[PDB]
Write a sequence for this structure.
């Protein structure tokens, strides 16, 4: 018993996607179906009845999205037009037991990521994060797509290196930071250089990090 | 299917 | 529009409860409250529906109840397999479904650790380049659930925050990072900015100021 989604991806603001949900294992025509998207929580978007006769939308997507189904092929669709940044989410389709009436069937698909971004491939700008123990870093700001790799002193500094995971900004560009704790006494003896490498854009940046 | 019947009414005003 | 606590925890064999607060026209008016468990990288599965009903297969230790405008999920005799995110759901009042924000249930098998927090002010180069990014880096806390608050002088700041959900480090503690985007004039025109990390009811704050 399974719901199999597809149709997501990276789309430009104003763009269109058509999400698909493919149903096997159960009597599709007999269940209301919903679309639910997930961001940091879950947000209910839309519902269509089993007999296709009746549809609901949350207000923010009214006018722009249209739910549809094809019972003859066990398929559920979400035509998304006029996409906004705020639409970026992991979209689930689901048969939800809200009123069971003796039938506790509840089933979700595996999700499909929609990211609304006008963002070309772009290498990062690398800025230094200058400083017992003392911490120093590299800001790897505004790149696309993922990932970057950070090392320090051509890989020869690795103890105390903590390269954190990246964030996806409103703008569609990613930023991460790499921070290393060195002994405070090392701030004169050692040169601290971070090496950021971003492969989709063939970008290799080095940046002196100095107090 | 009664779940269909009352769930549909539940999303109609 | 349905409120859950950010996170809750307990040891193997303890009992924990997750509340879920709605309004009167939703949780207070219908018995259509469901709960969903979600594991990292997987889709939600229903644990409870119609307030207190359990599908066969969901362990007997999961129970749901409702009082006034607040539903609750209790998990008796905790087990490590019960660690996950749990979302409540209710009929919304007008052809409608609303979800809670999520709660992270941690089944503890490691002593707690407050986070350590490093705040970096905007670099010289980035201000040259006309941007300003405050970098809050958060390490080594357990459980992996933390609240990030920003402050210009003493007033809360929400505009421009983007924050990473906590990820397991190699030391099986968690890390998150937060970024406050500022114009260079906002940055230079307050006496200080602050990153407040609250974990387990203890708060680690870090402040930076313009120079």
């Amino acid at each position: 018993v399974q719901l199999v989604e597809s149709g997501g991806g990276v789309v430009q603001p104003g763009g269109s996607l058509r999400l698909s949900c493919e149903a096997s294992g159960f009597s599709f025509k007999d269940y209301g179906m919903h679309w639910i998207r997930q961001t940091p929580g879950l947000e209910w978007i839309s519902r269509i009845s089993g007999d296709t006769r009746g549809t609901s939308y949350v207000d923010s997507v009214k006018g722009r999205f249209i739910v549809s189904r094809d019972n003859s092929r066990n398929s559920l669709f979400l035509q998304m037009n006029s996409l906004r940044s705020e639409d970026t989410a992991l979209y689930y389709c689901a048969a939800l037991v809200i009123v069971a009436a003796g039938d506790d069937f509840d089933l979700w698909g595996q999700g499909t990521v929609v990211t609304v971004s006008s963002a070309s491939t772009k290498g990062p700008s690398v800025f230094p994060l200058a400083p017992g123990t003392a911490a120093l870093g590299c800001l790897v700001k505004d790149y696309f797509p993922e990932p970057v790799t950070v090392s320090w002193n051509s890989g020869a500094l690795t103890s105390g290196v903590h390269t954190f995971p990246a964030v996806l900004q409103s703008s569609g560009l990613y930023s991460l930071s790499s921070v290393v704790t060195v002994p405070s006494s090392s701030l004169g003896t050692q040169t601290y250089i971070c090496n950021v490498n971003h492969k989709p854009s063939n970008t290799k940046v080095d940046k002196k990090v100095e107090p | 299917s009664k779940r269909s019947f009352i769930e549909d009414l539940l999303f109609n005003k | 529009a349905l409120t859950q606590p950010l996170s809750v925890s307990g040891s193997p064999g303890q009992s924990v409860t997750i509340s879920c607060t709605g309004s009167s026209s939703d949780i207070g008016s219908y018995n259509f409250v469901s709960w969903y468990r979600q594991y990292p990288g997987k889709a939600p599965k229903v644990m409870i529906y119609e307030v207190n009903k359990r599908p066969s297969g969901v362990p007997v230790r999961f129970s749901g109840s409702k009082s006034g405008n607040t539903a609750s999920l209790t998990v008796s005799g905790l087990q490590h397999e019960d660690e996950a995110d749990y979302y409540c759901c209710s009929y919304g009042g007008r052809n409608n479904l609303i979800f809670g924000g999520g709660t992270k249930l941690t089944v503890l098998g490691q002593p707690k650790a407050a986070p350590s927090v490093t705040l970096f002010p905007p670099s010289s180069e980035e201000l040259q380049a006309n941007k300003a990014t405050l970098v809050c880096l958060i390490s080594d806390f357990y459980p992996g659930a933390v609240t990030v608050a920003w402050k210009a002088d003493s007033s809360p700041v929400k505009a421009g925050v983007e924050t990473t959900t906590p990820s397991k480090q190699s030391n099986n503690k968690y890390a998150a990072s937060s970024y406050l985007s500022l114009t260079p004039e906002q940055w230079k025109s307050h006496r200080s900015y602050s990153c407040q990390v609250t974990h387990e009811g203890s708060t680690v704050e870090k402040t930076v100021a313009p120079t």
Chain B is about 70% helix and 0% strand. The interface with chain C takes residues 10-13 of chain B (CB under 8 Å).
